[PDB]
Amino acid sequence: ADLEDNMETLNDNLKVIEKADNAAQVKDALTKMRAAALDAQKATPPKLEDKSPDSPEMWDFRHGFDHLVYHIDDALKLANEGKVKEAQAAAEQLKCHCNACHQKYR
Ligand code: HEC
Numbered sequence: 622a623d624l625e626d627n628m629e630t631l632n633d634n635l636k637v638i639e640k641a642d643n644a645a646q647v648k649d650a651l652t653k654m655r656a657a658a659l660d661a662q663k664a665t666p667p668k669l670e671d672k673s674p675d676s677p678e679m680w681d682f683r684h685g686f687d688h689l690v691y692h693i694d695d696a697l698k699l700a701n702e703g704k705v706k707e708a709q710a711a712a713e714q715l716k717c718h719c720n721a722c723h724q725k726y727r
Pocket residue numbers: 624625628629631632635666667681682683684685686689715716718719720722723726727
């Protein structure tokens with residue numbers, strides 16, 4: 622999918638997690654977020670269109686998604702342990718990282 626669609630997937634599923642009734646629901650949402658993060662990582666954002674694909678900016682952009690995936694994986698651990706509230710709180714730790722990338726590259 623294109624970058625905009627993957628961002629909608631991230632945004633929608635964070636809301637799903639916030640509204641979830643059990644940890645399996647959180648797990649399913651996080652799983653979709655993981656996949657959308659890795660698909661987004663393949664994209665070139667508009668603001669870097671005129672930069673080298675090997676530029677430090679593009680590596681930073683890509684690495685931002687690695688870190689999002691790292692957080693998703695830690696929250697998945699909690700979700701798979703049935704810890705719905707902890708897993709929800711861990712998913713909220715994503716938000717600053719959404720914001721930081723947006724500040725740089727949106
Ligand atoms: C870079 C490492 C990013 C991270 C991490 C996250 N987002 Fe993002 N997002 C990024 C860019 C470069 C853009 C602009 C793309 C463009 O074509 O203009 C966006 C945009 C969004 C949007 C808006 C989509 C739209 O059609 O305008 C949303 C709703 C969004 N991003 C959500 C989102 C969330 C919830 C994230 C953390 C879970 C997140 N993004 C991380 C780059 C990056």
